[PDB]
Amino acid sequence: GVGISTGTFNNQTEFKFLENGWVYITANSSRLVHLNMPESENYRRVVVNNMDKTAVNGNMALDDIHAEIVTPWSLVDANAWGVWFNPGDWQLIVNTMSELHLVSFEQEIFNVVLKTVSESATQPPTKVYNNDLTASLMVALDSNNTMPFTPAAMRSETLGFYPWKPTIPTPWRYYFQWDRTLIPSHTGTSGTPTNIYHGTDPDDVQFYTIENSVPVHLLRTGDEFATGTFFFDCKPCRLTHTWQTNRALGLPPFLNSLPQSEGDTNFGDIGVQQDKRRGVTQMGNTNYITEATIMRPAEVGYSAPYYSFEASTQGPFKTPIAAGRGGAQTDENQAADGNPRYAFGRQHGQKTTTTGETPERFTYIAHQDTGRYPEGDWIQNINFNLPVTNDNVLLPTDPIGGKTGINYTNIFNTYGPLTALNNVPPVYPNGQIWDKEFDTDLKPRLHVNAPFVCQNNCPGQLFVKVAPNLTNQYDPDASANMSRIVTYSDFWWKGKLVFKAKLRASHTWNPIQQMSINVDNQFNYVPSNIGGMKIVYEKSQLAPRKLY
């Protein structure tokens, strides 16, 4: 079987329009993957300890210590938008559809190849690559999800984003329990705080091996591996955004006085004393019915502490925020809303002809207004009594704990039974698509890394590796790691991701926002005279929708 192909390369995106404005979107993607043999054939238990950085008072946030198990296997991950759609497809989806559903997924490996490097050490010296028609590529598909879930998108180590550029997988490794203590401090702080790595707790040790828990497949050149189809069980994702905040819900006040001259500087007027109006309020001790005072059904969005690090058994970590963008973009407070920032390079969006190790990056700012503008907040004594007196107001300007740079908004939290929020929006092309759910008794209401969370089981991970190619002399009783013939593999990967979407219709007299090419961005969607490419990020929920 050494002389014939076992597959077809396919990277077409098909749109199947069904009855009732429902679209069937089939995303074919295939790639050439290159794989080298492991540096070592054993599992290593390694600890990282950058105490040199955190030993400097006021550097707590740069903590990198952890323990991980380094495995001799590689992970083939394709969970990122860029792997399946090009800017052309994204425009069609984002401008036309109103919601997206994740249906099924499947992959395949074919046309496997294993070559061997012959070191013609002489003259230059030279190298020679020869096919080893009996060598084997090892393939393991963790279908029961025994292994820990490690989504490569998190560290931008997913499959490349160009159908015509070869790619590679990432070495697989997972976390291993450890106990760590780090006490906070600042520049002034005297002495040394407490920076200790206690070790490992016995009741939390879990050493996993692929050999012991998954059936391994041996593929030779004439072999091919296919996965069945997997059907997702997730909630639909909306491609629309809400714009109403608590201030724009319900019946506005009737204006007894209207403008008589064109110009947005000629205002209308309610025309009724603020303390003589009618309506409902949740302030029992006053008669002022203001647009900031009148009652609204519940609350859109919430306030959370910002640049807050909490600590537990293995060190400090940032407190996540699930928020939109409340606040005119020019003003914002991306910390308060927790906008994500993405760093990546060459293989996932950064200009292909660039040089150097500095990544490319961007901070995604959503369209939905479910965020907060802290500087606008304030708290006041119940006696009310305006104008409020300095002693009856806490401003995002008054210091807390004596600190001049810390607010109350800084540790404030207004999440409660009246809180309404929206899920996270897709992020093309660097975003992760789906995510496994936490196996805790009570689950989160959403995840901040991906729009689709598998309610049942997610698709298990696919691990690949080059089987050992031994020489004439091998001795099992040898501390010093043995010898293998330098071997590497090249194989084609192919996958299919099917979504189901719904076409939108016009409902307002005015046009809506739409993605479009133009004089300015034009050259971000075409190659350079040298063949340099790049994939600029786009936004997914242009197009408003009512909230209430």
Min separation Cβ 56 and its own copies, Å:
21
Per the listing, tokens 């629309």 go with 240
285, two tokens: 């001790």
The answer to whether residues 64 and 50 touch, using CB atoms and an 8 Å cutoff, is yes
Residue nearer to Ca ion on the CB measure, 87 or 327: 327
Residue nearer to its own copies on the CB measure, 25 or 237: 237
State the binding partner of 315 from its own copies, Ca ion, none, CB within 5 to 8 A by kind: its own copies
Residues facing residue 46 across a β-bridge = 68
State the binding partner of 200 from its own copies, Ca ion, none, CB within 5 to 8 A by kind: none
Min separation Cβ 235 and its own copies, Å:
8
State the binding partner of 242 from Ca ion, its own copies, none, CB within 5 to 8 A by kind: its own copies
Cα–Cα distance, 83 to 81 (Å, whole number): 5
363, two tokens: 């901070």
x/- letters, 369..388, toward Ca ion (CB under 5 A)? x-------------------
295, two tokens: 């009652």
Residues facing residue 487 across a β-bridge = 116
State the binding partner of 68 from Ca ion, its own copies, none, CB within 5 to 8 A by kind: its own copies
Residues in 234-273 at the binding interface with Ca ion, rule: CB under 5 A: 243
State the binding partner of 252 from Ca ion, its own copies, none, CB within 5 to 8 A by kind: its own copies
What residues contact 503, with CB distance under 8 A and at least 6 apart?
17, 21, 22, 23, 96, 97, 98
Cα–Cα distance, 312 to 502 (Å, whole number): 44
Min separation Cβ 68 and its own copies, Å:
4
Min separation Cβ 77 and its own copies, Å:
9
Question: What Rg, from alpha-carbon coordinates, does the chain have?
Answer: 29
Cα–Cα distance, 167 to 154 (Å, whole number): 18
For 110, phi and psi rounded to 5 degrees?
-145, 175
**For the CA atoms of 236, 238, 242, 246, what is the dihedral angle to 10 degrees?**
10
Min separation Cβ 376 and Ca ion, Å:
16
Residue nearer to its own copies on the CB measure, 204 or 275: 204
10 Å CB burial of residue 281 (0-12, 13-18, 19+) is middle
Min separation Cβ 170 and its own copies, Å:
7
Residue nearer to its own copies on the CB measure, 91 or 314: 314
Cα–Cα distance, 367 to 544 (Å, whole number): 9
State the binding partner of 360 from its own copies, Ca ion, none, CB within 5 to 8 A by kind: none
Residue nearer to its own copies on the CB measure, 34 or 318: 318
Residues facing residue 173 across a β-bridge = 70
The answer to whether residues 495 and 105 touch, using CB atoms and an 8 Å cutoff, is yes
Cα–Cα distance, 135 to 80 (Å, whole number): 32
* Contact positions vs its own copies (CB under 8 A): 46, 48, 64, 66, 68, 70, 149-152, 154-155, 157, 170-171, 173-175, 177, 201, 203-204, 206, 235, 238, 241-255, 310, 312-317, 439-441
Q: How many residues bind Ca ion (CB under 5 A)?
A: 2
Sole window of 92-100, 365-373, 422-430, 440-448 interacting with Ca ion (rule: CB under 5 A)? 365-373
The answer to whether residues 239 and 98 touch, using CB atoms and an 8 Å cutoff, is yes
State the binding partner of 250 from Ca ion, its own copies, none, CB within 5 to 8 A by kind: its own copies
Min separation Cβ 500 and its own copies, Å:
29
Q: Is 144 annotated as a binding residue?
A: yes
State the binding partner of 244 from its own copies, Ca ion, none, CB within 5 to 8 A by kind: its own copies
Report CA torsion sign: 272, 277, 283, 284. positive
Min separation Cβ 300 and its own copies, Å:
27
For 102, phi and psi rounded to 5 degrees?
-95, 115
Residue nearer to Ca ion on the CB measure, 20 or 508: 508
Positions at the binding site: 144
Positions at the binding site for Mg(2+): 144
| Site of interaction with Ca ion (CB under 5 A) | 243, 369
